[PDB]
Amino acid sequence: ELETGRQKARGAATRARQKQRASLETMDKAVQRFRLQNPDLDSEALLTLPLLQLVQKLQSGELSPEAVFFTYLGKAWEVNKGTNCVTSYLTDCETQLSQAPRQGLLYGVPVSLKECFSYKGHDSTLGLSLNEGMPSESDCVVVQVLKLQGAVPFVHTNVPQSMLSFDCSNPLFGQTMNPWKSSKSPGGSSGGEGALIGSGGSPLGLGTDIGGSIRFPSAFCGICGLKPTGNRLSKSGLKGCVYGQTAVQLSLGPMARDVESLALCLKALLCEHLFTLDPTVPPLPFREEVYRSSRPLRVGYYETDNYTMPSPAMRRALIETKQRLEAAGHTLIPFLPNNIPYALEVLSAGGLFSDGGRSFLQNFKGDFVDPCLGDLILILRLPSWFKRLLSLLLKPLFPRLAAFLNSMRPRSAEKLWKLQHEIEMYRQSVIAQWKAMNLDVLLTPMLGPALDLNTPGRATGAISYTVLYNCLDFPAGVVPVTTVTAEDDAQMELYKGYFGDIWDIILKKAMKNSVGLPVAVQCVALPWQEELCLRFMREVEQLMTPQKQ
Template sequence: MTVWSKLTYVMPDSVRDMMESYELYTGIQNNLPNVLAAAAVLYAVWKLTNFVIIKRKLNKKREASKIQIQKAKAKWCEVVDSDSRITLEEVDRITSMNFADLTKSLKDGGLKVVTVVRAFQRKAAIENQNFNFICMPIDADDVEEYARELDAMPVSDRGSKPLFGIPLSVKENEDVEGYCATLGCTRRLGVISEKNSPRVQVLKDLGAIPFITTNVPQGLLSFSCANPIYGVTTNPWNAKREPGGSSGGEGAAIGSGASVFGLGSDIGGSIRIPASWNGVTGIKPTAGRISAVGRHTSSPGQTMVKATAGPLASTVDGLIMAMRAFSSKQMFLEDPSIPQQFFNEEELLSQRPLTIGVYYTAGPVEVCAAAKRAVKEAADVLASRGHKIVPYELRDAELCSTKFFPAAVFGDGGAHLVNLLYGDELSHDISPLIKLLSLPLLLKKALNKIISFAVVDYAAEVIKKNEGVASVNDWCILQRELQEYIHLVISDWKSDGIDAVLCPPMPVPAMPLGDPQLAKSAVSYCVTWNVLNFPAGVVPVTRVTSADEEADKKNFPPKDMFHRVLKRGLTDSAGLPMAAQIVTLPYHEELCLRIMKELESEVSFQPLQRPLHT
């Protein structure tokens, strides 16, 4: 059957009759190739014209919004910088306090809430000029009004608010009443949140004071932190380095001392990477334990690998307080759809000796000397506290990062993300991905074949998965395979008597700006636990030494393009923070926090000190 025959076969009779009456039928039949070519050209012109129109509208919208954002920030900075009630010496003293001491001083009246909030506002205003982690400051008058309400509470009543007076920074993808959750995407500018997310509201009800929203990478799927609305966030330990992502603004804010406590989210290391690279703590809870309402993602709808909200803090005490809040009656009232699993104080406070599995490398991604040393030092600390440390090998470790994760996140072939960013200015780290996802399926398959010859096998497998799942049946098969894999891993833990696992969160310290787009597979050490849906937390342990650098010059293998990028970033990395990752079975966050707290109490890691007064 010819092309024309196929067309006329599916053509309605009325259309065919009309064409015959105007003698179009014969004309088109005789000039079918030219007609199809003209139609293709017209379609291409229409698509291009439509793209240009949308792009211009988005550019205009973004530039107008950026002016408003800059004015709002300038006004906020003017207000907090002109406050003569607090000196830079007091700002340094307050913002350098650890979470437990700050909480105690606020509750017993040693510090006024208004003073503490203004100290962190001022610190944030100054440090933001260096590292650009603020998206929007929360209105200073609203913040001060709530702070005064708290100060007016009798000291005897303050125990009802566990987070009494603690300033809270919030990742920009969370709903905060009166502010946008753009995900760094121009199309979402002007979409104002009508109310706080359940997490923000519960933290606020328990005494925390939201005072800034923090930056994210465009579309959230990156461990860089840049977007065309709010710009590039950098690392407070070295401004030429990445802060991690996608909770990179949180990591930089807390790492610089501009916040003590923040709310992030994690689908592939988005809490743990910024925590480890900025020398702070963070925990990714079991997805499903905490409400997901009012938290925006770039892959909504898929439930195979779920994102979850979670806290970052200067110390583990902050994480414990956050998880208590997220497991409280107030949270269950805000979102009755989540399981009523209250915080298990007994598991947190238990002194039972544990069996902790440890691994230094997993799958094809090599680990630098400082990352191995951080895990080794953590293992030694835990062993000295009476825990049994045993070798652990994760079965089929590469499956999580090369098969299940990309297939789940890009199960729709990236359609939602592409539509969200259509016509938008693309940041450097996501531009290659969006261009690839935007291609027609056949061209995408052909290009993936070509790319597979230029990169290592495991990276090629990840690239292939962005084609999407072919059918609902394939999705169900993938889901079944994942569930079987999860049960096998849990069975391994039980048969080996393992209570927790200790491993690196990342194979390298904070990478140079721009490098993460060339080394996406580095997230494999975090992604594993998202796919398995095990809670995982990060504790800073040590810093890169010159001896580590020298060892990596000799021993870190530049075996492919991916590892050459990692090795390049190890140069001049001395002084950067390195962390260890603690993992426990699902819904055992309290055990994870217990081990993190024990580790934190023994290591000699010192947070970054950046005094404003000299």
């Protein structure tokens, strides 16, 4: 195909940065007007309110919906200056403010949206030039449901280009930065959400997760996030770059400052409105009694997946929460899902790139490739025979690299059927393993602390802790439990990795210089058991960070 250059892509970038620029000015102007009319308002008391209390005061009338809206708008504008997490102000949101149903479970709550959640009259670019100047004709289903519940969606937040990354930079809106440390990634692909919520600029946000994109930015930015079972919530109207891939399910879910916020959001979403607007979603209501249960749990756990070497902080965080759960009366059982390398290298990678990345590469014709994607585009572009040849050469010394490369080759429909059956069988395998140990839930390390900017794209092995559960399609959630100590960070000098390949080398350097950064643990339950997963997340939060409850 003929080389078309980058002139369209450059035009899209100047247009996009203007829309972002204009958005933030409009935000600033709106909040200046409001503050002038309300010098009495205690900004800092309002912003430090846990969502549950914020909701309660909104419902009673103690706080006006305008007071909380403009106070958050101001904070979001402020934190954006150091993070670059906001791409667009949702301009019509002041009308929703007035129209917000007063009996709605999220009445008056400002909500941030990952850019891929289509909002009427706005682009969902995904950092891709071909999506610039293509405004959505309508709000997506979950946005419709949020509005019906009285919430006020107010911003679109940044994503890495195309979203196939756990960093957060694109050629259109640039690079999002961790609020804790500007040299660090906020994670991704829900990076903007993580940065925004993590710095206090949003009480609740929505992201998506197909390889860890809710959990990475939650862990990196010290906030809570939940990835439900793929089809617990509606994907209708969600902007993506590849359609029709059903092997590894996409999921959407809440991100917030406490697990109670995540549970409220699920409860609000799981309503008649959602089940009517999207009939393909099973009408499973939020089961309050499961979430609120105080029964002792049988908790499976592992300190390492034997694939990605945990940092000293990751390992400590896991052991500490394990010990605190034991002290609180729960029974902790060593458990590691079988055949993890297979789940990652052949099932996950093969399921995500069954067509050799051809559909994915279509989005990049005429576009810049953001450095945070590393060599993904270069690799996927290689002919199938060459991918195979390099894989063969790489295999004896670097088995991880060879297996991922082989699984990123195109295949027939016949072989996709075979792969899809293998995913179904693997899912039943881990379920049988789980049931044979009689587990309720599973405790796992969560990748942390935050990697340096532009390193996630060069440390692919590190997705092992998260993508395992996209493959299995188990609800998985993340909660901050500790911070990196000087001792934790110094021990990175001794970090080797299990393979010593390029991915291990990058990761050793990428996790250094992290003293003070948040570190998370991951909570997992069986498919459709979101309430139980949240019950477990609530427990972890209470034991590790009791002030949040």
